[PDB]
Each structure stands twice: as C-alpha cells, then as structure tokens.
Amino acid sequence: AFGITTSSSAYVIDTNAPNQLKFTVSRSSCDITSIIHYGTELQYSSQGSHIGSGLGSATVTATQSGDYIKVTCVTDTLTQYMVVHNGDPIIHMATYITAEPSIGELRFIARLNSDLLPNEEPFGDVSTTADGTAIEGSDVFLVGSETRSKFYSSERFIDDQRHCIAGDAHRVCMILNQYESSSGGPFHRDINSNNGGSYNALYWYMNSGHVQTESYRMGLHGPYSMYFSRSGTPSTSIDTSFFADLDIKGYVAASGRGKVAGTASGADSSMDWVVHWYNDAAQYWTYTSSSGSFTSPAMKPGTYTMVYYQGEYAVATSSVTVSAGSTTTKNISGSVKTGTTIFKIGEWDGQPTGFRNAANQLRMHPSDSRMSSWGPLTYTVGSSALTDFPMAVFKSVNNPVTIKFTATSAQTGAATLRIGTTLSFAGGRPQATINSYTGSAPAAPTNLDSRGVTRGAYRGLGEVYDVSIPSGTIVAGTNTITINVISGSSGDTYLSPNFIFDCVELFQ
Ligand SMILES: [Ca+2]
C-alpha cells in the first residue's frame, strides 16, 4: 500500500507504483540503503545512494500529505528532500543549500547494482571504467586498448534533460528539468554516469569545479527526478509542481515567477541560437526558433544579464528585469563582425566543431589510439580539410601549428589575424608569427584550475586573441603563419599548457 513503514533505524517508503517501487531511507544518515523495483534489490549494498559521499548524520522526518509522501533530511547547511506520488515509480528530489558542501561540489549519486544495470545511456560504454587501469589522475582509465572516463558520459546541460543506466529488466533515469541553481551556463557539462567495477553510478552534479566558469548558487537545487522502469524509457514531461504544497525550503512556485519573451536576430542563421539569463541567484536559457522567437522558462523575479549566442559564441548582451506573474518583452540583436576575409578556418560557434579529433574528444582521451595524429600539423588554405586542423594545440605534444596560405597583390595591406579559442589549460595562450613578423606575447588567461580537454570538455572563457599585421608583411604568393602555445607552466603530454580552438580568421 502507499505509505511509510517506520522502524527504529529507517523509514521504508512504498510508492504503490504498478511495477513496485519501495525504498529505505536511514533515519541516521538519510542514505537510501535499499531500493526494491519489481521485486528486485537495485541498491549497492556496501555504500548508500545519497548527496556527495553521504550526509553522515541528518535529522530525518517523513510524512504523508494526501497522495504525496515527503522525506526531509536536515543538516547544518543542507536539507535534502525526497518526494513520491502515489502510483508513480519515481523518487523526486530537491536539495536546499545555504553553503556549498565542504568538498566543493554538490552532487547526488545513486550507486546501483551493475549486474542488473550494466549499461549507460545515451552514450554507452565510454564511461564504463570497470577493469580499467588509471592513465590520468584516478579518473581516466584504459580498459583493454580503449580510454574511458566517467567524464565521457557528459552532456551540455541545455541538452541534458535525461540520462540513465539500464539492463535487460530495469532502467533508472534522471529527469532534469530545472538547472536554475547550477553554475556555468547552458553549455556547462558534467559527470552523468559511471559503471566503475563495483556498481554503476547514476548522477546529477548540481554544481562542481569541473571546468567551472561561474560562482556557485545557493538555495534550492532541482527538483530532479529518478525514474524506475522495467524496459520502458520515461518521457521528460514530468510534473513536479506539487512541490509548491509541501513547504520546501527555497521553492518558488509558478505563481512567484515571471518570464522574458521576444525575438533574437542578426546572428548566423546556419547555427542554433540560444538566449541565456543569469544573476547571482539563478540561471536560465532557451533555444530560439528559426525565426528567432523565444520565451524563457519561468524565472525567479529579479534583474538578469541576457546573452544571445550563435552556437556557444556570444554575439550580444543586455539586461532585463522580471516580475512575478508578468512577461517582460525584450528583443536582442547582434552579429559577429570581422572584415574582408582573406581566409577562415572553422566557424565562430564557440566550439572546436569540425576540427581534427573534436567529435572523438567528447567521448575518449586525447591519447586514445583511435584519435588522428595531433601533429605538429601544417594546414594549407585551399588544400587542407578542416579535419586536418588540430582541435587543440599542446605546448609539449603538437606545438606549433603551421598555416600556409596564398595572398594576392591586393591583399598585402594591413590585416588582423584573429585566433579564437574556447578553453585554456595551465596558462596556455597563442603567440603568432607571420612571415618575419612576431606578434606580442599575450598575458596568461584566467586559470580555471581544472582539467578539461582530457575529460571530454571544451567550454571555457572563450578568449580571443587578435594580432595586428602591418601593411607589407603579407606578401603576394605563399605566406606562413606559426601559432605557438606559450606558458610559464609545464606538464607531461596532454597536461602540458594548451588551448582548444574555436576559429582562426585573417581579415582586413
Ligand atoms: Ca568554432
């Protein structure tokens, strides 16, 4: 029956779902210590499913409110909520924090039986590290001759509404429709799952220091929902509005929110467009339609910075204020301006899309034998394909990148060489030489203090470096550009200073 079974050590919650879903919550730690779905135990027996690596000790309460049951777990700076609805095989959750956990990241981890749930969705075994030997830190491994990492299960948050682990008789998915308290914007990605050898972990990283570009946000994170199925795959359309009636700390209901609607215009129509709003309390985003129209998700009231991107490249920024129960009409427009182009490598989309190894880099390590050669490579404009230009240059692997190009007598005037990047590591930035002219050495970029290119990520601060080329330096005929990555830091192979390319353009 739908209900709560109380024992001195735990509360057992029965959702009364058709295919059965009951779970046990420790009254001492708030760990989920047992999960029974369709008569089968799914929880790893040696360590619980919980926030972080466990709350350790929490004050736990459980109550029924109509067709809902709420379990609340209070600690000094974090309150964890689990809510179930009679008849649904779902553990809905929300996590309220007044300070970031001591570890410096906020995650929920379900440690589930890997014999029953061996697979990872939607990316497969790229994040299966079971039987692997570490090749980088304790997070990238070699399984046979293939590189693997929990990071290779990652996805851009704007596109990560569902990820799961599964087997032939059970599937467990996270349904994520509320990233407002996370950090890093729509293009932040993070660890989603990892079959590591003892169990298969299913995660929601609410925030972390993994290629983090923003400060953390306090308040209520989520809701998020963990759905249990036999062989079905749940839709991401899951109503969690009932949280409004459960006195959930930090929960702002639909009635307390407003929206921003308008039309974005001017950017590159060959790219997807995204509008993003943020302030110290919350972040929101939406794709626009092909006509540029958009409507924001329901937003907490306040004043926000508003950004318009083509791909992940910001073309315009503005400010807007939202009030509860109202829609603020606000358009936004802009475009990427350069000049008369002599040559262009890649596109201004804030990504290394199209470059050599870019697709593989999201799902394997740069040292994987399946990667194409990193170089040093020579790209010749007019002959080389974009997949011959390295997605990244590392001071101690493929430095420098050489570009050869032909100019006409009409192109020998002053020009600007623009080297756009997405993410730096260990102070890497470009210094360019054009024929016998060397540009100045830029200062080191802001250090994000995080591995990234070796862990399937590329969304950094997007530093762009311009080099002014005087008239008469470009010559009619063949010209040579050398891009060296410079830095006072050092590292072994892919951990040497480096940066990922966005686009290189020479214009006048
Ligand atoms: Ca690009």
UniProtKB/Swiss-Prot annotation:
Main location, first listed in the record: secreted
Please write the reaction equations for the catalytic activity of this protein: Endotype eliminative cleavage of L-alpha-rhamnopyranosyl-(1->4)-alpha-D-galactopyranosyluronic acid bonds of rhamnogalacturonan I domains in ramified hairy regions of pectin leaving L-rhamnopyranose at the reducing end and 4-deoxy-4,5-unsaturated D-galactopyranosyluronic acid at the non-reducing end
Activity versus pH: the note is: Optimum pH is 6.0, enzymatic activity becomes unstable below this value.
Q: Name one GO molecular function term.
A: carbohydrate binding
User: Which EC class is this protein assigned?
Assistant: lyase
* Cystine pairings recorded for this chain: C30-C73, C164-C173
In which compartments does the protein localize?
Answer: Secreted
Alphabetical GO CC annotations of the entry are: extracellular region
- Biological processes per GO annotation: cell wall organization; pectin catabolic process
What Enzyme Commission number(s) apply to this enzyme? 4.2.2.23
**Temperature-related activity notes?**
Optimum temperature is 50 degrees Celsius.
* Job of this protein: Pectinolytic enzyme that has a positive effect in the apple hot-mash liquefaction process. This endolyase hydrolyzes the alpha-L-rhamnopyranosyl-(1,4)-alpha-D-galacturonopyranosyl glycosidic linkage by beta-elimination, thereby generating oligosaccharides terminating at the non-reducing end with a hex-4-enopyranosyluronic acid residue.
Q: What name does this protein carry?
A: Rhamnogalacturonate lyase A
